[PDB]
Design a protein around this ligand. Structure first.
Ligand code: LHY
Length: 157
């Protein structure tokens, strides 16, 4: 079931999401399935649950980046090195900006079946995760733009 992605301006993208407590359940497996499908129909590499108006610590992502579904995520930077790179947002369609993120992270959480997940990530993999994590804490990419020359429409830049 493809879901409606909500757009910037909606208060539901501004909340801080509660934890998932139904790992292994059929309801959650259904929601994850929906999320991968919705992510695919919109052509994303990442999608957080608040983007489809579900208030939960849950994200999907993957392109190389492993196709992953991740609940109750925590992220730890592994150095102070930041890197710049392009981002967009299915909730801000048409736009893109350059955004500084940590080059090296570790993330931890659970697969939908209850299995623990813990990985080190770098570059693009690491960026997609930082970006979706931001959704879980009510934060969007414009608030991290440093150089506003880079903010523009995809077809123009
Ligand atoms: O809406 C989302 N993520 O929340 N979508 C982004 C994910 C992303 C993150 C960082 C760099 C590029 C892309 C997208 O256009 O696929």
């Amino acid at each position: 079931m493809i879901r409606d992605i909500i757009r910037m301006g909606d208060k539901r993208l501004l909340r801080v999401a509660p934890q998932v407590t139904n790992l292994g359940s059929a309801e959650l497996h259904a929601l994850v399935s929906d999320m991968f499908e919705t992510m695919g129909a919109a052509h994303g590499v990442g999608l957080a649950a608040p983007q489809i108006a579900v208030d939960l610590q849950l994200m999907v992502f993957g392109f190389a980046v492993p196709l992953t579904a991740l609940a109750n995520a925590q992220i730890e930077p592994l150095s102070d090195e930041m890197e710049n790179g392009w981002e967009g947002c299915l909730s801000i369609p048409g736009l893109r900006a350059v955004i500084p993120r940590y080059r090296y992270i570790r993330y931890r959480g659970f697969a939908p079946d209850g299995s623990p997940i813990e990985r080190e990530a770098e570059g693009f993999h690491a960026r997609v995760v930082q970006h979706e994590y931001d959704h879980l804490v009510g934060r969007l990419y414009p608030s991290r733009i440093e150089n506003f020359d880079t903010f523009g429409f995809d077809d123009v830049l």
